[PDB]
Structures are given as C-alpha cells and as structure tokens.
Amino acid sequence: SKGEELFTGVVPILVELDGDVNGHKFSVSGEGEGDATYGKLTLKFICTTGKLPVPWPTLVTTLVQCFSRYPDHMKQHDFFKSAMPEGYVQERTIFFKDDGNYKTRAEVKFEGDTLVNRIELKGIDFKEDGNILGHKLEYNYNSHNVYIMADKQKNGIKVNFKIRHNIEDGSVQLADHYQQNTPIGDGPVLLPDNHYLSTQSALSKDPNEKRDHMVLLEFVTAAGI
C-alpha cells in the first residue's frame, strides 16, 4: 500500500496535546513506539503543565489507530495506513453521560520516521464535582470494540464506540465517542467495508517518575470480516 510498508516494523511515536477542560488548561507529551505487526503500542505520557485536571483514563482514546493490526485478509479495509505518510485528521466528540463533553481535533502523520499525533482538546459543561473534574475514575481500562464505516462523501470514515470508565464506587462512567477521520493528502485512500477494531489496554505507573504521568501498553486488532 501507500503506507502499509511504513508500519512493517517498529515505529517511534510522539504525541502532543493541548487541552482546556472548563477553563483548566494543560499540556500532555507522550513518547513510545508502535509495532503494527502485533497491533502493539507502548507509550509514556507526561502532564508537562503540572497536575492533570482530568483523569488520565479519559484521555486514552484521544492520546494512532494506524498501529492496529489488520489481518492479511482485511488489508484493503485499513484506511489509517493508506493515508500515510501524509496522514489524517481525526475529530471526535466524546459525550460523558450526565456530564460534559470533549471535542478533539488532531492530525497524525509522519515527521521523518516518527509517527506524530498532534491534538487540540476542548472540554465544556463538566460538573465541578463530577466523576471527571472530581477525579472519581479508577486508574484502569476496559477492552472495547470500535465500529468503523466508510464515509465516501468525505472520502474517509465515521467511527463509533462506547468507552466505559470504572468509577471508584464500583459504578460506571459512559463515554460516547463519535469520530471522523479524513486524509490530509489527496492521494487515494482505502474506504473500508464495515468492520471493527478490538482493543485492550493496561495502564501502569513508572516507579521513578515524579511528574503526573501514564504508562500505556495496548493491543488492537481488526476484525468482523
């Protein structure tokens, strides 16, 4: 493909995000690598502006689906790698049930041999004492199914799924994701038949790190065809 060859091996990854949730501004930087052959991602994120004003788990989906593993027989349904190396714009609205929403806009593309994800995140209408701004979400993460469909009019894809964040009292915080991706380049991209990505993530902490941070190990593989 145009970019399938680009992911054949280990690829370094840099992530940079600027956020404003209810007036609380913060910045997050992430480094690590992805190895699409195993749908594997290993990254470390740091809140560079100090204390993160929202729980780390709420940022996982925002902080490079091109690193998902698409089985050999589903290669022509991989939109993400097809738009590389010029990359793609990724937009979402994330609805936290009974609370605020995040709207994000990012561009992920290669800069030399490094895959970069640059994100702008805006959060509004959050409850000052809710699960999010109140930091009531447990530091862990569930496995989900990301549903992908072609959006030919936009020459991209529409994506939908539900993230369920565990709340510390044993309950759950639903986070409804609505996603749009479109190529940056004008070269041809693969428009997939419906399918979904199967995810799983493990959140950990670096024992010697004193800055507010998040270590992430994630595996994602395509299916449904």
| Cβ 62 vs Cβ 92: under 8 Å | yes
Report the alpha-carbon distance of residue 147 to residue 16 in Å, rounded.
25
Looking at residue 86, the DSSP 8-state letter turns out to be T
Q: Which residues of 106-137 are buried (b: 16+ CB within 10 A; e: fewer)?
A: bebbbeeeebbbbbebebeebeeebbbbeebb
Experimental method reported for this structure: X-ray
- Among the listed residues 113, 88, 85, 89, the one whose alpha carbon sits nearest the alpha carbon of residue 1: 85
- Among the listed residues 132, 160, 144, 180, the one whose alpha carbon sits nearest the alpha carbon of residue 19: 132
Question: Rounded to 10 degrees, what is the CA torsion of 191, 194, 197, 198?
Answer: -170
- Among the listed residues 14, 56, 13, 54, the one whose alpha carbon sits nearest the alpha carbon of residue 36: 13
Instruction: Tell me if the domain spanning 1-225 has CATH number 2.60.40.10.
Output: no
Report the alpha-carbon distance of residue 105 to residue 121 in Å, rounded.
7
The phi and psi torsions of 60 (rounded to 5 degrees) equal -50, -50
- Among the listed residues 10, 16, 3, 223, the one whose alpha carbon sits nearest the alpha carbon of residue 119: 16
Who contacts 6 (Cβ-Cβ below 8 Å, separation ≥6)? 81, 84, 85, 110
Report the alpha-carbon distance of residue 101 to residue 22 in Å, rounded.
10
Name the one residue in this structure whose structure tokens are 């590389």: 84
Who contacts 190 (Cβ-Cβ below 8 Å, separation ≥6)? 1, 76, 77, 78, 79, 82
Q: Which structure tokens are listed for 199?
A: 């995810």
| Cβ 150 vs Cβ 136: under 8 Å | no
Distances (CA, A) of 81 to 12, 126, 159, 183: 15, 35, 16, 10
Percent helix, strand and coil across the chain, each rounded to 5? 10, 50, 40
Report the alpha-carbon distance of residue 60 to residue 77 in Å, rounded.
24
The burial of 29, by beta-carbon neighbours within 10 Å (0-12 exposed, 13-18 middle, 19 or more buried), is given as middle
Who contacts 72 (Cβ-Cβ below 8 Å, separation ≥6)? none
Give the CB-side neighbour count of residue 62, counting CA atoms within 13 A.
Answer: 32
Q: Give the containing element (helix H, strand E) for 79.
A: helix 79-82
Report the alpha-carbon distance of residue 200 to residue 198 in Å, rounded.
7
Q: Note the resolution in Å, 1 decimal.
A: 2.1
Report the alpha-carbon distance of residue 152 to residue 149 in Å, rounded.
9
